[PDB]
Every structure is written in C-alpha cells, then in structure tokens.
C-alpha cells in the first residue's frame, strides 16, 4: 500500500512546476490580477488549473528528478512571462 | 571595626532577631568584647543568660553579628 | 606579599567571617608568622584560642586567607 501515497505525492510535486508555468498569467490579465482577486482563494485556483492541464499522466513519476532545478524554474518563469505578454 | 571606618546614611539601618541554641548571650558578648568588635553605641538587646536577642545598626555590623552567631552553634 | 605591591582604592575593601573546626586561630597565626604573610595593619579579629574569626583587607589578602583556611582545616 505504498503506491497510493506515492500517487498523490508525485502529483503535488508535478503541480509546483505547473504553478511556475501559469502563475505569471494571473498577474498580467486584467480580469485576473491581484487588484481584482484576493489572497486567500487565489492560490487555490492557480494550482488546480495547472492540475487540470498538466500534459503527462499523473500517476507516473515526473522526469524532474535532480536534473537541474534552479535554472529550470527560470526557464518556466521566462516562458510564463512570455505567455503573459502575448496574452 | 579596627581596620576601617564605614559610613552610611540614616535610612540604611537594618534589624535582625536571632535565637541561639547551645550558647548564651553572655558567652557571645565575651566574643564581642575580647575580640574588639564590641560597640557601646549599638549594643545587643536581650536577656543576659538566654538565646534570643535583638540587633540594629549599620549593614556591616548586623551581617557580622548574625553570621558570626549562627556559625558558633555548628561548632558547639 | 613579599613579591609585589598591590594597590587598590579604599572602596574595594572586602571582608569575611570564617569558622574552623579542627585548627585554632593561634596555630593559623603561627603559620602566617612562619610564612611571612602576617600583616600587622590588617590582623585577624577573633578570640585567640577559638575557631571562628573575622578578616578584612584588600581583595588579594582576603581571598588568600580564606583559600588557605578552608584547605588547611580540610587536611587536618
């Protein structure tokens, strides 16, 4: 019974990179920014939106494991601010 | 006290009451008279052959009478 | 103390009262006269053949008399 804990545990790791991709669109959009949205239910929305759109299957292990993590965050933020300035 | 002169203001005088078990007041007054720590201005108030007495004086005289009185009953 | 001259100011004089069990004051004074640390300006105040006494002087003289009395009485 170890895989049941591991299935939610691979998910909560996968949603962090999903947050890092889609978080700077919720700053850019005029009907979604912090001026129109509060603090308490904002971070509930941004996680489950990336959970409903994440491309790889959830029960599988993510390929993030110790490749290069601090520059990976600056990749996903740079493409996030790119998608923000296009949208 | 034979080696120095201490001076305090009047609002610092301390009081103490101490009861000895196995030595008398007249035997402790001989320890103050023979050693030279006797003081006629602030003597010891109490019955001469008993254990309970009353002291009041400078804070270096009171602490010396109490600490030299409670250190004789551990020896006698 | 036979080797150097310590100088303090007058508001640094400390004093103490100690009690010996199996060593007399006349024997401790004959030790201080045997060693040369006997100081006639700051002598020991107590009964000449008893166990309790009072000492007052410079802080290097008081801590010497206390540390040699409570290490001489424990040896005897």
């Amino acid at each position: 019974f170890y895989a049941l804990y591991f299935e939610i545990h691979h998910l909560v790791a996968s949603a962090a990179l999903g947050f890092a991709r889609v978080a700077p669109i919720f700053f850019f959009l005029p009907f979604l920014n912090s001026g129109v949205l509060s603090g308490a239910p904002r971070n509930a929305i941004i996680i489950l939106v990336a959970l409903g759109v994440w491309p790889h299957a959830l029960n599988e292990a993510p390929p993030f494991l110790s490749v290069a993590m601090i520059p990976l965050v600056l990749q996903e933020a740079a493409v996030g601010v790119m998608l923000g300035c296009l949208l | 006290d034979g080696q120095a002169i201490y001076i305090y203001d009047a609002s610092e005088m301390r009081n103490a009451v101490v009861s000895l078990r196995n030595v008398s007041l007249n035997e402790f007054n001989n320890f103050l008279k023979r050693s030279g720590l006797y003081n006629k201005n602030y003597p010891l108030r109490g019955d001469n052959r008993k254990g309970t007495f009353y002291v009041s004086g400078p804070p270096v005289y009171v602490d010396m009478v109490v600490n030299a009185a409670t250190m004789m009953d551990k020896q006698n | 103390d036979g080797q150097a001259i310590y100088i303090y100011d007058a508001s640094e004089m400390r004093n103490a009262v100690v009690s010996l069990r199996n060593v007399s004051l006349n024997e401790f004074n004959n030790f201080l006269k045997r060693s040369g640390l006997y100081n006639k300006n700051y002598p020991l105040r107590g009964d000449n053949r008893k166990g309790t006494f009072y000492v007052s002087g410079p802080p290097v003289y008081v801590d010497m008399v206390v540390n040699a009395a409570t290490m001489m009485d424990k040896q005897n």
Binding site: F1, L4, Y5, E7, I8, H9, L11, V12, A15, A16, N43, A44, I47, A57, L58, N59 | - | -
Partner: protein, 88 residues
C-alpha cells in the same frame, strides 16, 4: 489456499478520484471484517483457552494494531504534503 491476480496493468483513469474511492472501499471493508474476526475470536470461549489459538489471536491483534497506524501516519503525511502546497 489464496489468490494472486497476476496482471496489474495500469488501467488509465480519467482522474485520480476513482482510484482513491476504490482504495478507500478496498480497505474499509478490509478493516471492518478484521475488527469482527478478532473480536468473535475473543468472544468464543473455546478459541481462547487453547494457547495455540491464543498466540495466533495475539498475532492478529499485533497485525491489526500495526496496520491502521501505518495507514494513519501515511495519510496524515499526505494531507500535510498537500496543504503546504495549497496554503501559499
């Protein structure tokens, strides 16, 4: 004897909830019949006077004690993992 199904092929699921609901129903019926199958073992007198049956029931008590606490801290850590992300 006992049964093992050999092919645990990953039946791909539309969300993780049907998997959680089947794991919860797979184990609630497990622990419900365990809580009876050791209690009725205690409640019959012929089961408890035999030392041979008695250390078997000592064994199943130690299994049932170790099981629910192994599910307990595993889910408390799973909830603790998901709230630190969702709090923000």
């Amino acid at each position: 004897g006992q049964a093992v199904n050999i092919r645990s092929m990953e039946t791909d699921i539309v969300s993780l909830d049907d998997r959680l609901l089947q794991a919860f129903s797979g184990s609630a019926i497990a622990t419900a019949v365990d809580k009876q199958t050791i209690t009725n073992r205690i409640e019959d007198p012929n089961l408890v006077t035999d030392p041979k049956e008695l250390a078997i029931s000592q064994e199943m008590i130690s299994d049932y004690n170790l099981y629910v606490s192994m599910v307990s801290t595993l889910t408390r850590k799973g909830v603790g993992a998901v709230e630190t992300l969702l709090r923000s």
